[PDB]
């Protein structure tokens, strides 16, 4: 019990405080919403989560121990696709994707980006992409890494209507698999409310 | 035992005055017992007086950029915000020594040398050092978002004190290939060592009241809107 | 009680190298006032600042 | 994840930001021109000059390549790399750095040949400069990662990075124009060949560490 | 609208603290001070090399300053100022440039009395190279500016649009150190200034024509 | 007769033809939706309107002159925030909005800030601010400008509902007057479907 937990995070930036006094546990199968609006530190805590940034004061826990210490273990089981999407722009769509595969790639690849919706794009560069497009290649990834833990930051910043319904399809079947979704939108789900958990930044 | 919340500013400022007053004290009496009383050199006569001028703001060039270099590491491995801060409070003074010891140098070789730049060990390994000085402080004032500027900062300080005994060595080196050597090693006189460690010592006490005044500014700056200040 | 130089400004301030020795004294006395007084008026100056943004 | 897969990534990015990488080139060709048309029909100076001005022009190309080492990351994907891949980020820095150096510090040491014609030296003043050459720029890469992981952030491509990592360089250009000096008397290297492999050897293991530290500053 | 508030953008975004004006005045210290540790403390010698040297430093520091002029621009708000800004793009280009020339160009200007002295240069010296510095810095962004417009702009660039940056700028340091080392030959140097008068108006009446041109080319 | 009015415009990427004669004119007052999927041409569009962008065989007509024949007749009335927003992150909210003013008294420019949602974060760099209040600087230009004609390309990426609810709200009412607002969203607006004509990609 407790794949992820929360020890009491504190952020606090000049004269304003994020969030104060926050613990929550998640286990398997829990599909997590971050709740705010423009001012509140959901990508902070989200950052904070993943460890990229070290909390003021706190320690978040991975299976019952602290983020440095399990930091090669914990990656291996982590998904992070942030505002920016994290995809090098020159490259076409197919090695961007590539990279982030470890084994069968290039059989797998092509598959994957067939699911996103990019069937024919595979070759294109990424620059010459639409500014949806470009978020389908990062949200690629939903359909080839095996990580239990997927912390997504906007994945519907511009994808279609048909898209968005795609991507809450996947990350719904992600879940009874033993899947943690950590999710942060503006546009409402398209899922009963007892499926999402919602927690606020108090 | 070591708190240090903003009451480090009435620290600060309790040890301002009188270290002030005794290093204002010290610099007079030890540039009253040079410029004036103590001996001459017989070689380039009262051109040695530049002596209290000059060797204390070389010493403590590099005393500054030590301290620098132990208050980045301070900060650094037990992650201190203000151990950071300390950075940037000497790093202006150690770039104001190092320009003054570039100036009395230069203005102590023109008698000798004939011009106001000759390319020796002594000027160029305090010249390398004020491009570092220069280079953190253009660091530290580069960052919008502080808390970051101060661990940059101590990086690069720590990066720096790394290679400043390799580039100390170089260039004593490479003064050695190019002209064979220096002049010669500047000897020291007993009637006037006394003075010349008045000097060193009152610029110790300046350096400290110097830095102990930027600390509070800098620690106002950073926290210009805790309600602690509401003085 | 003993100076160096036997009499005022006629022997002092002038030893064969008054232009260089000087020099030096002006142009250490300069940067270090400066700094003294940059660092006095940043500080009440960032006083000033904390009163002005309490309207 | 694995260290080969991100050399290779970054070798393909690279060859595909052509124009930028070739800029270097030219402006080490064009200083290394130009002082020999500067100085007219005259050999003996050239001789004495010439290590000291091939030096400075590769100096002055490897402060030019490394705008890009980090610059078209923070963007879009500085992270994915520390907050992925298992692989520590030391690890990470290196495979960087070393795919760097295969487009940086490589091609002038290709050109070496070309240029020990061009400045009239001999077969033993061109060995002499291609070792210094390959003891060198890999330190120099070594020497940069820590200054463009610290200004990442700032998005100040120009003359702050070129004030940060240049005093750094300052012993190995010291040690290589006296090598190559030495090298124009004929008289045995082996002690200037030694102290760049030690540097080298120096600055290749802490260097990873420390563009780590700062990158991980950078990145809150 | 209102192209000097496009010129004081541009100077704003350069600089943001009274401290950081200082910047490139370092940067050409330390690049200056690159080549004596490499060729040596010899005060004659360096004479000779003073034209290369300083010209180094000024084409390095206008390299350098030229990235940032567009390519920063192109991810957020390069444009913005062909859609808006009703002022015709060529205006816009020279604000661009005059930006760049005083965050470049001024600096080693400011600093021409000090690094006179440094390398030795005397008065008449020092003369012609503030009036080679004042009639030719400038162009430097003006002819530079073309090239950079297509390279940091153009996708699927290949290396050919290298060749209008840095192999464009020959002419200007060719003549300019011919002028300086005429100048220290104590020659007549008004045959090589009149020259550099011409490339300035002709060049600065063309230029941000031909770079607005690139821009809408590029942009498309 | 009337304002812009693409005539039998033609524009296709890589082989396929995005769309292939678009002929419709804007008059006074309409507030149009240009719908498509997530890779038709939305933004080329855009672009193409703008005179950003030449049309590939076609040409698009400003009061009756092109836009390369007027350039200034245009460009004063006219008001374009693409996918990127065009603001100088390492400026402050207020010089960043101070250089797209009029003359900038600095008097209305905080009153827009405020206006737009954004009051508080007036003097924090840009850069600082969290993801859509980065858009919120960009989108705080439609209270100052007197442009009568908007090309607003996906204005609601990153805004929660509120600022949604308020952008809504004043494109709404800038378009009763006299405005002209031609939007690319794949939120659907909240407006009663009579008050937008949507025109498709053909
Ligand atoms: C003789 C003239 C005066 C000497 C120079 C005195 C400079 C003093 C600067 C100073 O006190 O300010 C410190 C300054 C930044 O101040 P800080 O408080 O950190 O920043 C404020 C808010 N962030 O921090 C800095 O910018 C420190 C700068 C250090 C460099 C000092 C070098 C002196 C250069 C003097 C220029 C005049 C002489 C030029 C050459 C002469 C020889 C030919
Ligand atoms: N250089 C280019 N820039 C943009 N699109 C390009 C380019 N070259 C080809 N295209 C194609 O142009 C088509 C339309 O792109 P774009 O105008 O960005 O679409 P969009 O529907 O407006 N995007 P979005 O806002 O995310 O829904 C896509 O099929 C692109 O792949
Ligand atoms: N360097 C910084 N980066 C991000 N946020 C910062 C920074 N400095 C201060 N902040 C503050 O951090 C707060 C929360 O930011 P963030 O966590 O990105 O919010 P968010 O709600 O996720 N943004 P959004 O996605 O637009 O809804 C904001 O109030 C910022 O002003
Ligand atoms: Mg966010
Ligand atoms: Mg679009």
Known sequence: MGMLEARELLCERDERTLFSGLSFTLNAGEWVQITGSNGAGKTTLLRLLTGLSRPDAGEVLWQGQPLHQVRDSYHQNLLWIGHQPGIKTRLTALENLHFYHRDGDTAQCLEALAQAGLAGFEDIPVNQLSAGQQRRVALARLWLTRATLWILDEPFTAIDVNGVDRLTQRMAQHTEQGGIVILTTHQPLNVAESKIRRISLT | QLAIPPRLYQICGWFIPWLAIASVVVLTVGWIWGFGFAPADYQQGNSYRIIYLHVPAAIWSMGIYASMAVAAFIGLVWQMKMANLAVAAMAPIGAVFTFIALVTGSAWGKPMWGTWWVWDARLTSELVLLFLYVGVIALWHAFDDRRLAGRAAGILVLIGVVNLPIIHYSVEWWNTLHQGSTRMQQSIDPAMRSPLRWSIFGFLLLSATLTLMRMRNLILLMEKRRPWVSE | ?55 | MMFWRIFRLELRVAFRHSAEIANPLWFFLIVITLFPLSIGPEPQLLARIAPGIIWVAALLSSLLALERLFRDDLQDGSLEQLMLLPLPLPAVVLAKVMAHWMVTGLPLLILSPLVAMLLGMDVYGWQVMALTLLLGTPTLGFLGAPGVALTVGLKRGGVLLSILVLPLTIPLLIFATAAMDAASMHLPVDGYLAILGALLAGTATLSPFATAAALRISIQ
Do not use: D
């Not at chain 3, 009680?1 to 020795?21: C, D, L, Q, R």
């Not at chain 3, 400066?34 to 940043?42: G, R, T």
């Not at chain 3, 100056?45 to 309490?54: D, H, N, P, S, Y």
């Open chain 3, 1 to 55: 009680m003993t100076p160096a130089f036997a009499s005022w400004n006629e022997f002092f301030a002038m030893g064969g190298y008054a232009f260089f020795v000087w020099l030096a004294v002006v142009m250490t006395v300069i940067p270090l006032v400066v700094l003294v007084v940059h660092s006095v008026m940043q500080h009440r100056a960032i006083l000033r600042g904390v009163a002005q943004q309490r309207a």
